[PDB]
């Protein structure tokens, strides 16, 4: 008569509620393994992510606690919704795992990057990202860590963002993706809303080029790739850097920079029709306004939404949707356990 059951998925053991049938491993991350499943009660498929011992460290603890609180309060069609939360353990002392249940999407933005997208779908996906990011911004959430792996899509081209971003030692077997972070994060500078526009541009640029824009082993190799293509930023941007960082960037080999038609030629864009020729210029024009190193010269979310390549889908309810305790703090690993439990158990 137990409400839960246990199946072995991959290498781990998933102990889920009886309503969740047939688990198929669909994803895996740093904080948990994601399985797709059927929900008998709701009569639909869902995605179940298992946070194995989230409170084991302050980074993973802060992450888990924050996503849990926001996935409940934030309510937007372009930000993943939480359907059910649960733990198979009965007491705070026995407490080990957390199970996040969300609507099931069909794939990653990484899988969509591997294919040639038409201007209709590319601008719609892009319009959705900016739609959710805008909603997050109105709620006081500035992501700063958007990556394809955390953006999920459905077959009908609907899009949703998975995580809530950045609020940090981690002894782990796995990597962190830096490729989509803004200069005001690579170089530590202090940001504002449009820091997410850079990530959107790194994604669009990859959706077009079909390969990572600014790769690198470290932030040193990555910044190398930023200036090698876009060129050394203007002498007004550098006066905003910290004196120890300013030194490093200023004394770094100079580059004039490539132009956008060179970075993103017409060969990468479908320019057969006359409609596609104009859209291919518009797309390139948006990229040129998103992949700008200086935040003061970088386009805003609102203006990127009013751009001719994106605004063809503008909708008042989707763009200007209404937004909703002060959470950017510090605790020990057992204090976090308590906070996570009392959240999981409303």
Ligand X SMILES: Nc1ncnc2c1ncn2[C@@H]1O[C@H](COP(=O)(O)OP(=O)(O)NP(=O)(O)O)[C@@H](O)[C@H]1O
Residues catalogued as catalytic = 145
State the CB neighbour count (10 A cutoff) for residue 300: 15
Q: Which one of 150, 199, 222, 282 is in contact with Mg ion (CB under 5 A)?
A: 150
Least Å from the CB of residue 150 to Mg ion? 5
Closest alpha carbon to 205 in 188, 230, 223, 185: 230
What are the φ/ψ torsions at residue 171 (nearest 5 degrees)? -90, 85
CB of 277 to Mg ion, least distance (A): 36
Q: What phi, psi does 272 have (nearest 5°)?
A: -95, -55
Q: Choosing among ligand X, Mg ion, none, which partner's interface includes residue 80 (Cβ < 5 to 8 Å by kind)? A: ligand X
The answer to whether 282 contacts ligand X (rule: CB under 6 A) is no
> Taking CB under 6 A as the rule, does residue 31 contact ligand X?
yes
Instruction: Take residue 135 and report the two structure tokens written for it.
Output: 């909603």
Least Cβ distance, residue 134 to Mg ion (angstroms) = 20
Which residues of the chain come before a gap where C and the next N are over 2.5 Å apart? Answer: 167, 324
* Contacts of Mg ion in 4-33 (CB under 5 A): 29
162 binds ligand X per the rule CB under 6 A = yes
Burial (CB count within 10 angstroms: exposed 0-12, middle 13-18, buried 19+), residue 281 = middle
Residue 185 marked ligand-binding: no
Tell me if 102 sits within 8 A of 45, measured CB to CB.
no
Q: Is residue 152 part of the contact set for ligand X (CB under 6 A)?
A: yes
CA 110 to chain centroid: 12
Among 16, 32, 199, 340, binds ligand X (CB under 6 A): 32
| DSSP 3-state of 102 | strand
From the list 16, 17, 48, 104, which residue makes contact with ligand X (rule: CB under 6 A)? Answer: 104
**Is 280 labeled as ligand-binding?**
no
- By CB under 6 A, name the binding residues for ligand X: 26-32, 34, 47, 49, 80, 102, 104-105, 108, 149-150, 152, 162
Residue positions in the annotated binding site? 26-34, 49
């Amino acid at each position: 008569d137990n409400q839960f059951y246990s199946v072995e998925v991959g290498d781990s053991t998933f102990t889920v509620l009886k309503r969740y049938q047939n688990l198929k491993p669909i994803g895996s991350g740093a904080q948990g393994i994601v399985c797709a499943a059927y929900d008998a009660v709701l009569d639909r498929n869902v995605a179940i992510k298992k946070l194995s011992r989230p409170f084991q460290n302050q980074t993973h603890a802060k992450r888990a606690y924050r996503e849990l609180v926001l996935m409940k309060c934030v309510n937007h069609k372009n930000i993943i919704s939480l359907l059910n939360v649960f733990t198979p353990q009965k007491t705070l002392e026995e407490f080990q795992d957390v199970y996040l249940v969300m609507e099931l999407m069909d794939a990653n933005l990484c899988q969509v990057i591997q294919m040639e997208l038409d201007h209709e779908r590319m601008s719609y996906l892009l319009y959705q990202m900016l739609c959710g990011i805008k909603h997050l911004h109105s709620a006081g959430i500035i992501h700063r860590d958007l990556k394809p792996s955390n953006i999920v899509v459905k077959s009908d081209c609907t899009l949703k963002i998975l995580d809530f971003g950045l609020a940090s030692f981690m002894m782990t077997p796995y990597v962190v993706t830096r490729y989509y972070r803004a200069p005001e994060v690579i170089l530590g500078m202090g940001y504002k809303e449009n820091v997410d526009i850079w990530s959107v541009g790194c994604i669009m640029g990859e959706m077009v080029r079909h390969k990572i824009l600014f790769p690198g082993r470290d932030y040193i190799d990555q910044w190398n790739k930023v200036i090698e293509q876009l060129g050394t930023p203007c002498p007004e941007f550098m006066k905003k850097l910290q004196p120890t960082v300013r030194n490093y960037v200023e004394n770094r080999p100079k580059y004039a920079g490539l132009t956008f038609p060179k970075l993103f030629p017409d060969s990468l864009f479908p320019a057969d029709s006359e409609h596609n020729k104009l859209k291919a210029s518009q797309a390139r024009d948006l990229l040129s306004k998103m992949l700008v190193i200086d935040p003061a010269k970088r386009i805003s979310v609102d203006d990127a939404l009013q751009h001719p390549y994106i605004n063809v889908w503008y909708d008042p309810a989707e763009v200007e949707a209404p937004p909703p305790q002060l959470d950017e703090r510090e605790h020990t690993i057992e204090e976090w356990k308590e906070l996570i439990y009392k959240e999981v158990m409303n």
